[PDB]
Ligand binder design. Structure first.
Ligand SMILES: Nc1ncnc2c1ncn2[C@@H]1O[C@H](COP(=O)(O)OP(=O)(O)O)[C@@H](O)[C@H]1O
Ligand SMILES: Nc1ncnc2c1ncn2[C@@H]1O[C@H](COP(=O)(O)OP(=O)(O)O)[C@@H](O)[C@H]1O
Lengths: 233, 712
């Protein structure tokens, strides 16, 4: 199965998808640090429920300083806060986003402890114009994870009547000792399986062995004009 | 490579076969692609391939219609060759087979071929034979001309022609209305047992001609009449190709001395000449009754002749003899000695699932109305066997025929296909036939998987786990093969035995006091051997001995007559248990309300080693019991089940059920009186509480606790 990476245009296989997109997002920081960190927050982190809480908590910190830009107590986001640690600190790309939208990582004295604590502090250059953070907040909240687009690989085929012309060997229909012993063993095992007294948990352990083989499909369409149309979904 | 062993179909459709997905991935064909199948005698057939979760990796599943076109049988091998070049057809010519179009007239295309092919896009090849069902007739057609060759897809734009006399069947072609494996409903396990024993020596004679060890010479099929004993024997012969010789008691016994024995041995000689062959002897108890029960020379000499004919099978290579009887103990015991008829299969009585499948088989040709529910019929037809379900479908058809035929008024040698195809059988016609039908096996014990599950038992969470461990441990990893339940009555002893059988999909055999007492009083404790033999044949099963001390009570219980702890029946039970292995897949459960007076032998190591105490439910369990009992009825939000449980401190599960049913009786009466309210209200439970009482006294609990403390 083949995919196209929307950030590079490269043709990838199913296992190469995350490797190329992640690299493209980390390189994108040279063009637009905010857009690159936004892609990293949604794309790198597999747990989307935590990503939604992370970006919502970041949006609240930005709106707090937006409402009271003249009060210094809303300019510093504490990295050791219980809410920050659970929702934001657990995700990749959230620290890069803060730096990209004008927050510096500094150590400030605590209001009740000698040991300095870690804060993200908004600079005066960005605080003077809240419209910049308001746009960056919407760009983060409106984002989605980056995933390689599935290549349909539209193809049409013409069957060849020659593929159906084959003659079997004269001894084809003569079964071997292994084929006859295997069939009789399967008959004895089939009768035994019906005879066994077992609980539902033992039954499910065997039945469940057939459930995990596929996550992609190839479809064909037989058209009135004799053409065979195929694509990947 | 590209070759698979022919197996039974799951999808009954005649244009499709099923492969295991890994083989479709090796052949690089998709679900719905058209393939050719290469069979014996340079013949081929065209069909569509799908896949499922049940086909073996090395097998191909195809039905009888496809196998006949390839002239192959179950166990053979065919090649699969995809043919994506198949094109849509322009014109086909299909004509019926005369053997199935007799007595029927009208426009066969409009009734059969048109809806069969319309929007179906079925592959078709010249020379194909296929079956279309409808109008209470099974009509098969042969393909005589295709404009494209040698095969095509029949599309809605393909011209379907059908003109000319019906085709006479060729001598190499078999009728699709002959009994096969697809005509057998329930008793799949029994059929599988016959396959293991019979199909190999018949499909591959060369395997046994090279060795001095003979395959089983005789198989005894027993059970009530109308269960399929003859149907299985015929289906196996027809599917493997062995010649089927039919013998029955009355045919031989009706003859005079000399002619009788001559006919019996002549049939055996014919089977040898036509070997491989199966000889089916019906009513074995009539041809070979117990000699000690008759003084006639004819009966004794026929038994002696049959005994020598069975022994002669070591020379009559590839001849297998099968016999049908009502009971293995109703025939002369000489036949059951080493050799001869030393393999026995219990056909039994179909359960609710088997009865449904049997009805679905019989209705294959019948048009059913939208109101017909065969599952409901199968649940009502308790005590019926396949012969009675066949009569049921016939009677339902005849009632439907009369209702419409009074309007059709077609009096001639043949009946139009259109007027038969427009006839549908309604639910009222099945219910009418059910009222007129009378089951032939009503007095016989019915053994089936119970419908009681773990969600029906309140409380006892640890006992549930214990039973699951006792059954699961010997299979997942000397484990005990039985448990005795003791404690107050009405706490779930029987339900526990049923629930473990339910979850395991095991047969539940219920032995109740009256049956233990009948054996005692009638001095017929030999029936215990048949009970344990039934448990073995029914495996997997749970053999439940309720009221274990019922006979001790019949003999005085606390007083006593000529006996005490042990009796005729329990000693026969001990005899059989000591001969049963843990590998027989039979789990024996007992129950008693007086564990102090049961023959202590039953609890000695190797027998009922596990003992579980079932006390009265606690408060949280009583709530669970009330919720389970009310799971089938609407209950008002004002009903406080926890409050009721708090009051009913000394009540058993059976006593809580009486309260629920009393509340139902009151709620249903109010609804009926209003019609002449829709849910059970607290007022109905509060009134029930005025009559319900605990059935287990405090002194009885002490008695059970002391026993539990005795064992620890
Ligand atoms: N287990 C079964 N499955 C399907 N059909 C059955 C079964 N048992 C009986 N029948 C039907 O009942 C009839 C049996 O009659 P018969 O051929 O005399 O056999 P037997 O009397 O030995 O059961 C047939 O019509 C058969 O289709
Ligand atoms: N633990 C339980 N949970 C739910 N219902 C119970 C329970 N114990 C007894 N009953 C009720 O009592 C009735 C009789 O139970 P049963 O197991 O037949 O008693 P016994 O084993 O003494 O014959 C059942 O219909 C059931 O509704």
């Amino acid at each position: 199965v083949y995919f196209t990476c929307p950030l590079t245009g490269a043709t990838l296989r199913k296992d190469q998808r995350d490797a190329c997109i992640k690299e493209a997002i980390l390189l994108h920081f040279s063009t637009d640090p905010v857009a690159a960190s936004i892609m990293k927050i949604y794309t790198f982190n597999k747990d989307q429920d935590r990503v939604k809480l992370g970006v919502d908590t970041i949006a609240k910190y930005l709106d707090n300083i937006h409402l009271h830009p003249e009060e210094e107590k809303y300019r510093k986001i504490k990295l050791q806060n219980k809410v920050f640690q659970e929702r934001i600190n657990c995700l990749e790309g959230t620290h890069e986003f803060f730096e990209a939208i004008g927050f510096q990582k500094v150590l400030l004295p605590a209001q009740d402890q000698e040991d300095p604590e870690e804060f993200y502090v908004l600079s005066e250059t960005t605080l003077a114009q809240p419209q910049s953070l308001e746009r960056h907040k919407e760009q983060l909240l409106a984002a989605e994870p980056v995933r390689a687009k599935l290549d349909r690989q539209r193809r049409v085929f013409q069957p060849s009547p020659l593929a159906s012309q084959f003659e079997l060997p004269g001894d084809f229909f003569n079964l071997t000792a292994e084929e006859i012993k295997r069939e009789q063993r399967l008959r004895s095992e089939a009768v035994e399986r019906l005879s066994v007294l077992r609980t539902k948990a033992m039954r499910e352990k065997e039945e469940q062995r057939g459930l995990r083989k596929y996550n992609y499909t190839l479809l064909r369409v037989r058209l009135p004009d004799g053409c065979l149309l195929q694509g990947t979904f | 490579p590209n070759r698979l062993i022919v197996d039974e179909a799951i999808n009954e459709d005649n244009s499709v076969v099923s492969l295991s997905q890994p083989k479709m991935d090796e052949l690089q064909l998709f679900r719905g692609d058209t393939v050719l199948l290469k069979g014996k005698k340079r013949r081929e057939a065209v069909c569509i391939v799908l896949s499922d979760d049940t086909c073996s990796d090395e097998k191909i599943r195809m039905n009888r219609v496809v196998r006949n076109n390839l002239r192959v049988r179950l166990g053979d091998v065919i090649s699969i060759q995809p043919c994506p070049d198949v094109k849509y057809g322009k014109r086909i010519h299909v004509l019926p087979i005369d053997d199935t179009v007799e007595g029927i007239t009208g426009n066969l295309f409009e009734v059969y071929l048109k809806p069969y092919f319309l929007e179906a896009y079925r592959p078709i090849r010249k020379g194909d034979i296929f079956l279309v069902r409808g109008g209470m007739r099974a009509v098969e057609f042969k393909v005589v001309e295709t404009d494209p060759s040698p095969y095509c897809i029949v599309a809605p734009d393909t011209v379907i022609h059908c003109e000319g006399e019906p085709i006479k069947r060729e001598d190499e072609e078999e009728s699709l209305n002959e009994v096969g494996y697809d005509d057998i409903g329930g008793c799949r396990k029994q059929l599988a047992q016959i396959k293991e024993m019979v199909e190999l020596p018949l499909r591959h004679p060369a395997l046994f001609k090279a060795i001095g060890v003979k395959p089983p010479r005789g198989i005894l099929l027993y059970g009530p009449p109308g269960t399929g004993k003859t149907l299985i024997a015929r289906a196996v012969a027809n599917e493997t190709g062995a010649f089927f010789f039919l013998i029955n008691g009355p045919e031989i016994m009706s003859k005079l001395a000399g002619e009788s024995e001559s006919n019996l041995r002549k049939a055996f000689e014919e089977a040898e000449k036509n070997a491989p062959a199966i000889i089916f002897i019906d009513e074995l108890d009539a041809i070979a009754p117990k000699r000690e029960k008759t003084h006639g020379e004819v009966e004794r000499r026929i038994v002696s002749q049959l005994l020598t004919l069975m022994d002669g099978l070591k020379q009559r290579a590839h001849v297998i003899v099968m016999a049908a009887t009502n009971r293995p103990n109703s025939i002369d015991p000489a036949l059951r000695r080493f050799g001869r008829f030393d393999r026995e299969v219990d056909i039994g009585i179909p359960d609710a699932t088997g009865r449904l499948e049997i009805l679905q088989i019989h209705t294959k040709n019948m048009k059913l109305a939208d109101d017909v529910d065969l599952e409901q019929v199968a649940n009502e037809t308790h005590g019926h066997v396949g012969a009675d379900l066949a009569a049921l479908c016939s009677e339902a058809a005849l009632q439907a025929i009369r209702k419409k035929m009074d309007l059709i008024d077609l009096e001639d040698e043949t009946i139009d296909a259109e007027v038969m195809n427009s006839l549908a059988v309604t639910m009222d016609d099945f219910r009418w036939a059910l009222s007129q039908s009378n089951p032939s096996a009503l007095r016989e014990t019915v053994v089936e998987v119970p419908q009681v599950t773990w969600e029906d038992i309140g409380g006892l969470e640890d006992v549930k786990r214990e039973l699951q461990e006792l059954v699961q441990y010997p299979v997942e990893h000397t484990p005990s093969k039985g448990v005795l339940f003791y404690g107050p009555p009405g706490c779930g002893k029987t339900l526990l035995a049923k629930a473990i059988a339910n979850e395991c999909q095991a047969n539940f055999i219920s032995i109740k006091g009256p049956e233990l007492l009948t054996m005692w009083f009638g001095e017929s404790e030999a029936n215990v051997r048949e009970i344990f033999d039934k448990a073995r044949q029914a495996a997997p099963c749970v053999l439940f001995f309720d009221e274990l001390d019922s006979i001790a009570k019949a003999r005085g219980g606390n007083i006593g007559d000529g006996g005490g702890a042990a009796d005729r029946v329990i000693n026969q039970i001990l005899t059989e248990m000591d001969g049963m292995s843990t590998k027989k897949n039979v789990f024996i459960i007992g129950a008693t309300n007086r564990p102090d007076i049961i023959d202590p032998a039953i609890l000695r190591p190797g027998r009922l080693d596990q003992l579980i105490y079932i006390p009265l439910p606690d408060e949280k369990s009583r709530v669970a019991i009330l919720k389970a009992n009310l799971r089938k009825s609407p209950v008002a939000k004002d009903v406080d089940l926890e409050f009721l449980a708090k009051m009913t401190n000394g009540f058993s599960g059976a006593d809580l059920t009486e309260i629920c049913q009393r509340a139902c009786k009151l709620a249903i009466r109010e609804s009926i009186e209003s019609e002449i309210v829709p849910e059970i209200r607290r007022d109905h439970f509060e009134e029930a509480m005025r009559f319900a009482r605990r059935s287990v006294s405090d002194n009885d609990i002490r008695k059970y606790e002391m026993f539990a403390q005795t064992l620890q």
